[PDB]
Design a protein around this nucleic acid. Sequence first.
RNA 1: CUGACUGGGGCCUGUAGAGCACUGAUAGGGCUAGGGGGCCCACCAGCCUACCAAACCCUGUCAAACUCCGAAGGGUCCCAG
RNA 2: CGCCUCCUAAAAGGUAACGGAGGCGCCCAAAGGUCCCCUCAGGCGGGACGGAAAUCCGCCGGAGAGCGCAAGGGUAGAAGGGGGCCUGACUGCGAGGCCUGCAAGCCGAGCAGGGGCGAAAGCCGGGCCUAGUGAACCGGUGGUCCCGUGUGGAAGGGCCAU
RNA 3: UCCCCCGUGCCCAUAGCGGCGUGGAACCACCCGUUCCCAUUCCGAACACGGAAGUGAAACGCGCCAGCGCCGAUGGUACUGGGCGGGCGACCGCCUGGGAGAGUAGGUCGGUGCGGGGGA
Lengths: 69, 53, 77, 110, 141, 181
Amino acid sequence: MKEGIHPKLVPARIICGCGNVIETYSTKPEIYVEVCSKCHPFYTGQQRFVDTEGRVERFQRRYGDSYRK
Amino acid sequence: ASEVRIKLLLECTECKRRNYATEKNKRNTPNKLELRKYCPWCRKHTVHREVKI
Amino acid sequence: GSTRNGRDSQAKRLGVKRYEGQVVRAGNILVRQRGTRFKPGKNVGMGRDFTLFALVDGVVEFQDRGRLGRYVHVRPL
Amino acid sequence: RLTAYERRKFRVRNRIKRTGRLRLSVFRSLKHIYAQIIDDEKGVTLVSASSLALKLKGNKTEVARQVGRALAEKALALGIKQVAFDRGPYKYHGRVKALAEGAREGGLEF
Amino acid sequence: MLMPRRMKYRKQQRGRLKGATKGGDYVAFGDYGLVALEPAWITAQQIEAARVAMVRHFRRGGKIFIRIFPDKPYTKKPLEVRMGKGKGNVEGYVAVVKPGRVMFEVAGVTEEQAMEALRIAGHKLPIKTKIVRRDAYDEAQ
Amino acid sequence: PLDVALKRKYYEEVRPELIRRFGYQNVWEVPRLEKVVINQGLGEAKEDARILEKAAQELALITGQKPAVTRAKKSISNFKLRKGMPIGLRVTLRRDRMWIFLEKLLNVALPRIRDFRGLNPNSFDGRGNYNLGLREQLIFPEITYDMVDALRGMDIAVVTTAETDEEARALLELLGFPFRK
RNA sequence: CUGACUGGGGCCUGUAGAGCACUGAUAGGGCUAGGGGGCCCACCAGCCUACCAAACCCUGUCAAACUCCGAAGGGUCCCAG
RNA sequence: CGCCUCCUAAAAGGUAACGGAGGCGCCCAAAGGUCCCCUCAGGCGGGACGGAAAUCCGCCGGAGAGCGCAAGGGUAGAAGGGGGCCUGACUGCGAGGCCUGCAAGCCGAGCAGGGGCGAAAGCCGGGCCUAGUGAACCGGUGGUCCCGUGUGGAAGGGCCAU
RNA sequence: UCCCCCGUGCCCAUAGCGGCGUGGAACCACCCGUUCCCAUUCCGAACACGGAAGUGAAACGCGCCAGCGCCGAUGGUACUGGGCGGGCGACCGCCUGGGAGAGUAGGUCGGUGCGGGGGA
Ligand SMILES: NC(=[NH2+])NCCC[C@H](N)C(=O)O
Ligand SMILES: [Mg+2]
Ligand SMILES: [Mg+2]
Ligand SMILES: [Mg+2]
Ligand SMILES: [Mg+2]
Ligand SMILES: [Mg+2]
Ligand SMILES: [Mg+2]
Ligand SMILES: [Mg+2]
Ligand SMILES: [Mg+2]
Ligand SMILES: [Mg+2]
Ligand SMILES: [Mg+2]
Ligand SMILES: [Mg+2]
Ligand SMILES: [Mg+2]
Ligand SMILES: [Mg+2]
Ligand SMILES: [Mg+2]
Ligand SMILES: [Mg+2]
Ligand SMILES: [Mg+2]
Ligand SMILES: [Mg+2]
Ligand SMILES: [Mg+2]
Ligand SMILES: [Mg+2]
Ligand SMILES: [Mg+2]
Ligand SMILES: [Mg+2]
Ligand SMILES: [Mg+2]
Ligand SMILES: [Mg+2]
Ligand SMILES: [Mg+2]
Ligand SMILES: [Mg+2]
Ligand SMILES: [Mg+2]
Ligand SMILES: [Mg+2]
Ligand SMILES: [Mg+2]
Ligand SMILES: [Mg+2]
Ligand SMILES: [Mg+2]
Ligand SMILES: [Mg+2]
Ligand SMILES: [Mg+2]
Ligand SMILES: [Mg+2]
Ligand SMILES: [Mg+2]
Ligand SMILES: [Mg+2]
Ligand SMILES: [Mg+2]
Ligand SMILES: [Mg+2]
Ligand SMILES: [Mg+2]
Ligand SMILES: [Mg+2]
Ligand SMILES: [Mg+2]
Ligand SMILES: [Mg+2]
Ligand SMILES: [Mg+2]
Ligand SMILES: [Mg+2]
Ligand SMILES: [Mg+2]
Ligand SMILES: [Mg+2]
Ligand SMILES: [Mg+2]
Ligand SMILES: [Mg+2]
Ligand SMILES: [Mg+2]
Ligand SMILES: [Mg+2]
Ligand SMILES: [Mg+2]
Ligand SMILES: [Mg+2]
Ligand SMILES: [Mg+2]
Ligand SMILES: [Mg+2]
Ligand SMILES: [Mg+2]
Ligand SMILES: [Mg+2]
Ligand SMILES: [Mg+2]
Ligand SMILES: [Mg+2]
Ligand SMILES: [Mg+2]
Ligand SMILES: [Mg+2]
Ligand SMILES: [Mg+2]
Ligand SMILES: [Mg+2]
Ligand SMILES: [Mg+2]
Ligand SMILES: [Mg+2]
Ligand SMILES: [Mg+2]
Ligand SMILES: [Mg+2]
Ligand SMILES: [Mg+2]
Ligand SMILES: [Mg+2]
Ligand SMILES: [Mg+2]
Ligand SMILES: [Mg+2]
Ligand SMILES: [Mg+2]
Ligand SMILES: [Mg+2]
Ligand SMILES: [Mg+2]
Ligand SMILES: [Mg+2]
Ligand SMILES: [Mg+2]
Ligand SMILES: [Mg+2]
Ligand SMILES: [Mg+2]
Ligand SMILES: [Mg+2]
Ligand SMILES: [Mg+2]
Ligand SMILES: [Mg+2]
Ligand SMILES: [Mg+2]
Ligand SMILES: [Mg+2]
Ligand SMILES: [Mg+2]
Ligand SMILES: [Mg+2]
Ligand SMILES: [Mg+2]
Ligand SMILES: [Mg+2]
Ligand SMILES: [Mg+2]
Ligand SMILES: [Mg+2]
Ligand SMILES: [Mg+2]
Ligand SMILES: [Mg+2]
Ligand SMILES: [Mg+2]
Ligand SMILES: [Mg+2]
Ligand SMILES: [Mg+2]
Ligand SMILES: [Mg+2]
Ligand SMILES: [Mg+2]
Ligand SMILES: [Mg+2]
Ligand SMILES: [Mg+2]
Ligand SMILES: [Mg+2]
Ligand SMILES: [Mg+2]
Ligand SMILES: [Mg+2]
Ligand SMILES: [Mg+2]
Ligand SMILES: [Mg+2]
Ligand SMILES: [Mg+2]
Ligand SMILES: [Mg+2]
Ligand SMILES: [Mg+2]
Ligand SMILES: [Mg+2]
Ligand SMILES: [Mg+2]
Ligand SMILES: [Mg+2]
Ligand SMILES: [Mg+2]
Ligand SMILES: [Mg+2]
Ligand SMILES: [Mg+2]
Ligand SMILES: [Mg+2]
Ligand SMILES: [Zn+2]
Ligand SMILES: [Zn+2]
């Protein structure tokens, strides 16, 4: 590589919120990230964050069978 | 040749004689031409300067 | 009624000037041409206007080299 | 469809052939280096030299030099003195350069 | 009627009418053809009159193939001027036609119909013509 | 060459699975990563603050490689574009730097992508290469909110020695490329 | 003795003719972006076209300023009459 | 109304008309020399903003792109694109020719001086080429130090360059 | 003087495209590295250097295949130098010498020189 025009790559720790630590290389030796592949909802099986709801509607009303028959 | 593309002389900077005629575009090349050139009087190459024709 | 044509330029007298087997002297113009319809071969130079001319005394020889073009050679006598 | 390599080769070689000198061609493989001095007018090789033929051994540059010296010695034996260097597709540098320098040390003229 | 949509040059030298047709001498589409017996410049208006005569005869049905095209500009000087002052203006377009040319072909029609239509068409043209029928000779071309 | 997890993961786990999945008879026949090419289309730097040196500084922090300027082949009326104008950045990553970039790309970058539902399965060359585009540079761990003036994304070409999309799909997913469908 | 003219040999050429590979023209058919139109929608798509049609392919053609080709001749040099 | 390109022009050259079509009266300090490197248009597939067309990736693609500008010839085995160093866009000449009524116009190896690039072979006396131009006369400016009306100077001229 | 490979020429597609098969001992290539020389408008991709674990996957070489591309008769014709006729003309013929282009039959998945290294 041409000298003096590139950022040097050093060993690096990327630290996620989930406690994941990634040993890699970068131009900044320490980095914090809010998310990573190990915790992100799309990756983790299908950990459906807040809504694993399943619609819920529309026959999901059932309040109730009370009309006459 | 035109108003902007002028004719000019090259003067041997050492003995002051005009040895070459040529042209330049004074919009593109506003500074005086400086060129090494053979001077037949000095019998060697010499920096020649642009001088009004 | 009038014409906006009526122009033409002087004919330039281009072409081969010395054909194969002709005895030429060095400097003899061999071909006047636009671009390289003929290419300089052995003992033939080429001028800034593509003019082919003999570099040595000798005999003119032509050669057609397919995709490599037609060449004009001079063979020393 | 030609390659950069093929074009580069033609380009430097065509230029050499125009001058009409005996042509010193150099082939450089990953392992070896070869030289033949060629008469392009008769389409014949006059003298040859290579690392493969001399069973040379060590550092590729120092080897190149030696095959150069060798080519020279044989060449001078045939009365071949003046030559034109055909670097072909190679930069004039390193191994090729070394061979060239070795040829010159031997008294090949170029 | 027929004329080039566009061209490289507005005006053409007149040229010559020597020889039999270059090509176009065998029936290539229809069952019957109208062949040129004499050389001529055939005008676009002649061609159209021939066409219209044939569709008029057919009334409804049949297919006409027009195998010549007037791409040659026809030139005439404005009336009562003298010679000189440049080439006259383009007044029309003509198809160069030489002996043996199949100018028109018909199909989808009975022999009686085709014979008659091509006859009437021939009367609109400035040359002698011949009616022909598709042949093995044509097929072998 | 550096010990890097993804690179190691390619040789240790990915190669055997690929040899398995397709049964190559030659070690050279199995899908390899040739280069990753990153391109910033930019040209919002055509005139104006034609200092895209801000962007080049950003690309270099991301890749460890200084991008090279791209210039307009011809002049263009409607994009307001004259020949030779500096319109973009392009960096060709190979070997250890290529692995390192993809490594962070999978682990960190793509996760940080907004409303990420996975890479587009259909974006394959047809000849076994893949391409994806980004909206922001903030995706990457190297870039923070402080140090960035504006939002500029990029194009990413991942070139493979694989002859088919099938093979290329196999290799890339094995490496950890997360596909939606 | 070199001449016109002629025999042999080599080189140069782009006409006649022809051709359509290039530049353009070109009828019909096929195939098929693009519109016109009709069903059916504003929920953004669909289906039908004896409608005008680009590119492409087929059949058939056109050209002083077209040529993948290409004569007869013509020119020039050498030896000989 | 001079000049350039094509056709007319009858396959060497040349060839007319108030015959058919277009251009020129500039330009470039690099768009010049050399050394090194690189190869197009276009089609298809892929890619944030990005579109028919900006930049990126892959495949096909001999030249249909490019070559400042008309047209023709030529051309990637570069004349096209990029970079380094540069000024040969030399001085003094010039075998030999092309063209040709004259006068012009054109090509030019090679020798010498002092250079540029290159390891070298070598190339370089502007520009891919063909238009971008104007004989004398009269006069200007720089140089030269040749003439200088009895002599020394001077006036004024000559010569070289413009 | 025979076969294989490596260089380098010549003919200038009968030599090319595509398909298939084949070769690593040798040679060639990819390859292993990027300390050193040298190098990237970024990149050891290229250029370059030092190597020698591996693979003939890519490239290259060598076979086979006629889908394409390329080549292509013999006949006959057009045209025509020279010589003659005919038509009022546009134009049409005869004699003698020359003679295409298109197309048909068919051909082609190269041939050959010089020097190296290896094999018999
Ligand atoms: N050289 C020749 N024989 N030319 C023949 C042409 C003469 C005449 N026009 C003819 O058709 O017969
Ligand atoms: Mg360094
Ligand atoms: Mg007028
Ligand atoms: Mg005229
Ligand atoms: Mg005039
Ligand atoms: Mg004239
Ligand atoms: Mg003239
Ligand atoms: Mg002329
Ligand atoms: Mg000639
Ligand atoms: Mg020259
Ligand atoms: Mg020149
Ligand atoms: Mg011969
Ligand atoms: Mg010869
Ligand atoms: Mg006339
Ligand atoms: Mg009439
Ligand atoms: Mg008329
Ligand atoms: Mg009158
Ligand atoms: Mg007139
Ligand atoms: Mg008229
Ligand atoms: Mg009319
Ligand atoms: Mg006809
Ligand atoms: Mg009639
Ligand atoms: Mg036919
Ligand atoms: Mg491996
Ligand atoms: Mg796809
Ligand atoms: Mg691939
Ligand atoms: Mg970030
Ligand atoms: Mg005599
Ligand atoms: Mg004589
Ligand atoms: Mg004579
Ligand atoms: Mg004779
Ligand atoms: Mg004709
Ligand atoms: Mg055509
Ligand atoms: Mg055809
Ligand atoms: Mg004609
Ligand atoms: Mg014709
Ligand atoms: Mg003509
Ligand atoms: Mg013609
Ligand atoms: Mg032929
Ligand atoms: Mg002849
Ligand atoms: Mg003759
Ligand atoms: Mg003769
Ligand atoms: Mg005699
Ligand atoms: Mg003429
Ligand atoms: Mg002519
Ligand atoms: Mg002529
Ligand atoms: Mg003639
Ligand atoms: Mg003459
Ligand atoms: Mg007039
Ligand atoms: Mg004018
Ligand atoms: Mg420069
Ligand atoms: Mg330069
Ligand atoms: Mg492209
Ligand atoms: Mg696209
Ligand atoms: Mg988009
Ligand atoms: Mg796009
Ligand atoms: Mg072009
Ligand atoms: Mg350059
Ligand atoms: Mg210097
Ligand atoms: Mg002279
Ligand atoms: Mg004269
Ligand atoms: Mg002139
Ligand atoms: Mg000198
Ligand atoms: Mg010197
Ligand atoms: Mg020198
Ligand atoms: Mg030096
Ligand atoms: Mg020198
Ligand atoms: Mg010279
Ligand atoms: Mg130029
Ligand atoms: Mg010029
Ligand atoms: Mg140049
Ligand atoms: Mg002049
Ligand atoms: Mg004057
Ligand atoms: Mg007077
Ligand atoms: Mg005076
Ligand atoms: Mg004076
Ligand atoms: Mg005195
Ligand atoms: Mg006195
Ligand atoms: Mg005194
Ligand atoms: Mg005195
Ligand atoms: Mg005084
Ligand atoms: Mg005085
Ligand atoms: Mg003067
Ligand atoms: Mg070989
Ligand atoms: Mg093959
Ligand atoms: Mg095998
Ligand atoms: Mg193979
Ligand atoms: Mg091996
Ligand atoms: Mg083995
Ligand atoms: Mg280092
Ligand atoms: Mg070291
Ligand atoms: Mg490497
Ligand atoms: Mg290499
Ligand atoms: Mg090794
Ligand atoms: Mg293989
Ligand atoms: Mg190779
Ligand atoms: Mg066979
Ligand atoms: Mg042929
Ligand atoms: Mg044939
Ligand atoms: Mg025959
Ligand atoms: Mg006759
Ligand atoms: Mg007549
Ligand atoms: Mg006849
Ligand atoms: Mg006859
Ligand atoms: Mg005969
Ligand atoms: Mg012919
Ligand atoms: Mg034939
Ligand atoms: Mg073949
Ligand atoms: Mg060979
Ligand atoms: Mg030979
Ligand atoms: Mg051998
Ligand atoms: Mg041997
Ligand atoms: Zn996490
Ligand atoms: Zn001086």
